């Protein structure tokens, strides 16, 4: 078979399908009009888009496909460098940042960093609380606040206080704004153009700024000693099992970047989305609700009353369905193949995983593939393999899976028990889209059930 291309502009080919501010939703259109695959060529470049579990379960097959750098972190490897995120597998570092991490990031992991998580999400419940009786609450705003600085705690011990303040710590500013730039570029058919000059210059002064205070902080680490059971002195004393060395101050300085980015984009999101699912259906929100006074007995959470959380954990699960906040990933091919029996591939060839058009598979999910149920978590076994990809596929899969998961449980169980929610706005979904996806201008009322911590 032919694959099916959308709409071409001469000699830019499909590059103008970028040229929007929420690519990531015009690409699923695309699917739904051509199908499970299409190609998109832009001028030197070509790429295909899978949407059906069908394709996406081969592609994930490790021995036939590995993970690529896309245009957007080849960009964002300008300031995340060679840490995890932005490394390719055949990199050194890769597998040695891999070895080293991976205890810091088990199941195992969480119940160390959890009074660090508890910490900030009493700041959270402590807002709320706090708030009079005319005010609302801006949902992925507070959320960010809660998740950076979570990651901030957990990573380096670093308190960026964000609850006490109104606009951003000057390395989120930066960071925030170098993200955006790395986004922006991907649409970009002349940059050197010099239309673009004020950006590049941004952006390098972007970078500076990211680099002294993480430089600053690793510094500050080694010269005072200290031992807090924190990501940078897992790394500082860390030593890769199988070179035998330890990671590099540059190296971890990328690290220490990568996870702020992880920490602020995609977990804020996560509970954006979260929250909005359960305000727009009461029966499921009641049900958490339930599930959370039940099993939250005590002034604070324990790390094994969160992983009583079930039915909130169904819900993060449905959430990442309908809305997985990392939308997509890269793969190449690493040898010629055929793609499902019908496609030849040669070797480099690029696929790009629409991962919510693979949540919406009807094959897999069923006709109401749009309807918010977590119970269709219920049993996950008869699940087909490859079917849900929120965080990614096998050793490239996200380190931070489980951190991400433990924390949402967490905040939402607390949320759940402290308060009932109205969406008093009656919120249209509005999705903005950056190196990740965000329910834009949600804004909800909370009602304290007076449950004091
Ligand atoms: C709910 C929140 C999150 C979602 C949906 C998510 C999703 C993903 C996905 C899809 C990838 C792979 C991207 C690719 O193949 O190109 C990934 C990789 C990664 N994530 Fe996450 N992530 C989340 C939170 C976090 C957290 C909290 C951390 C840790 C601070 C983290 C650290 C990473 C790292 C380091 C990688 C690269 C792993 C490697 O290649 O060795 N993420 N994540
Ligand atoms: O960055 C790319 O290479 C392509 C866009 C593209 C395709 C062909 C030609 C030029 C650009 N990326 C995409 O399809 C989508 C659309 C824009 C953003 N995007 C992404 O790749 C998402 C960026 C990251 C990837 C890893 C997990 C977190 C999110």
Redesign the pocket.
Known sequence: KEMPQPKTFGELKNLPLLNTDKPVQALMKIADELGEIFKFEAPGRVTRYLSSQRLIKEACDESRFD????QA?KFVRDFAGD?????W?HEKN?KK??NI?LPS?SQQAMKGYHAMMVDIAVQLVQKWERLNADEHIEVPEDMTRL?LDT?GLC?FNYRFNSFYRDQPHPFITSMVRALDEAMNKLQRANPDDPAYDENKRQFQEDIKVMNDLVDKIIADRKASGEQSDD?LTHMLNGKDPETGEPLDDENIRY?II??????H???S??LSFALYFLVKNPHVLQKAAEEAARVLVDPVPSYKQVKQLKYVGMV?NEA?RLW???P????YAKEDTVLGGEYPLEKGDELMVL?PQLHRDKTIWGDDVEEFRPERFENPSAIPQHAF?????G???????Q???H??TLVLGMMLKHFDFEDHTNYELDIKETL?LKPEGFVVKAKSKKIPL
């Open positions: 993970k690529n750098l896309s972190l840490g995890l995120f932005t490394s597998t890769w940042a891999h991490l990031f998740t990651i990573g990501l690290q990568t996870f702020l980015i992880a920490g984009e995609t977990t999101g996560l993060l990442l997985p906040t990392a997509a990933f890269s793969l991962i990809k929120p965080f990614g596929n050793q490239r899969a996200c380190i931070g899976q951190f991400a998961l924390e949402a990740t």
